[PDB]
Structure 1
């Protein structure tokens, strides 16, 4: 069922001592000509919207964004509005997170570990509703002041891989590359990179290329 997923999302929930509020951009590796938008408010999801892109997202970098305001979320693809939600919008500030992971599946028919799956992200921009809360991250190198790598555990549940910090790497030309690897025992190691601060309403933009 759930195969390979590359994502850009905001998150907060009970490990952070709050209700689960989250806004998603996710790409399923089974069809990268589409993108899926969704969000959870107080743990309630069921807002999936799948958009056809008109291009195969895995072939180049595109800019995806969501503008999260008190009364709506609006999602954009390369500056073009694609979807607006207005119902039960979330309101708790969260961390910005990016991951690549496999669920518990037919993507294994083509998976070859000598040319592993990688999701690449060239930059992230957050333009805050609160003056002085904006930031730009170009992914030239690991910045321990603003981000952390997930390592040493699995989320469990739908996730069928263990986060490894050594699957989070930076290329010499400035991209964050998250990899999904398997060396034996049908065990996969995957990767998540996440901010250390939390952010609220504003425009979140990412330039990325999902795995396939």
Structure 2
């Protein structure tokens, strides 16, 4: 069954509860290869995802994924996304074809082109289009703040430091998924992310993640 409530402080790599994407690229808009070497833990207990390069116009990025799958409940994360044109730092639930299910996800994405805003979205059976951009009232890249989504049968509610910022009720996903965090540079989506200018290294940091089931 779907995993139970938990609290992850990111003190170290726990290959029992989390996995590091490694040796492949998502392709498409993801113009980088996931590297386990890019998922690291600081001395002070922060997950630190890195976007790096060791070759011309060639980038290595990072994705950390839960081994367990999770359903309806409250998802919270304290993080500090990267700031730079053409990148994304994220916290999200995901399942899809590569997992042997329909595409259901709920996502928080910080577009590096403007870290004073955040984007919320979700997909149900591969149908998305629920994008919402929210002004934060601060630059997220400058400190750790707490972001969350409460995923329930008839709604998703997103919060920033406990303040309700947006509510969705239409066609809410139901297929349990992995909790994931990633940092990556885009290609072919300059209008959305800005073009990426190869700045490296860049990092997204996460202090903890908490999930509370129904």
Corresponding residue number in structure 1 for 2:212: 127
Question: Does residue 118 of the first structure (1) align with residue 203 of the second (2)?
Answer: yes
1:65 and 1:31 map into 2 onto residues whose CA distance is: 19
Corresponding residue number in structure 2 for 1:41: 124
Report the alpha carbon displacement of residue 112 of structure 1 after superposing the two structures with TM.
3.7
Corresponding residue number in structure 2 for 1:71: 154
Report the alpha carbon displacement of residue 107 of structure 1 after superposing the two structures with TM.
5.1
Aligned residues: 126
Corresponding residue number in structure 1 for 2:106: 23
Which of these residues, 171, 175, 182, is aligned with residue 92 of structure 1?
175
3-state secondary structure, aligned to 2:98? helix
2:88 and 2:186 map into 1 onto residues whose CA distance is: 8
Report the alpha carbon displacement of residue 16 of structure 1 after superposing the two structures with TM.
1.5
Question: Does residue 102 of the first structure (1) align with residue 188 of the second (2)?
Answer: no
Residues 1:17 and 1:108: Cα distance change in structure 2 (over 3 Å): closer
2:102 and 2:90 map into 1 onto residues whose CA distance is: 21
Tell me the TM-score normalised to structure 1 length. 0.57
Residues 1:21 and 1:112: Cα distance change in structure 2 (over 3 Å): closer
Q: Whose RCO is larger (CA < 8 A, sep 6+)?
A: 2
- The runs of 5 or more residues in structure 1 that have no matched partner are 130-212
Deviations 1:19-62 (A, max 9, x none): 10000000000000000000000000100000000100000000
Report the alpha carbon displacement of residue 17 of structure 1 after superposing the two structures with TM.
1.3
Deviations 1:97-119 (A, max 9, x none): 0000011055544x543xx1100
1:35 and 1:29 map into 2 onto residues whose CA distance is: 10
Tell me the TM-score normalised to structure 2 length. 0.56
1:108 and 1:7 map into 2 onto residues whose CA distance is: 17
- The runs of 5 or more residues in structure 2 that have no matched partner are 1-28, 30-84
The 5 Å alignment of 1:128-147 reads 128-129=213-214
2:150 and 2:138 map into 1 onto residues whose CA distance is: 23
1:108 and 1:12 map into 2 onto residues whose CA distance is: 27
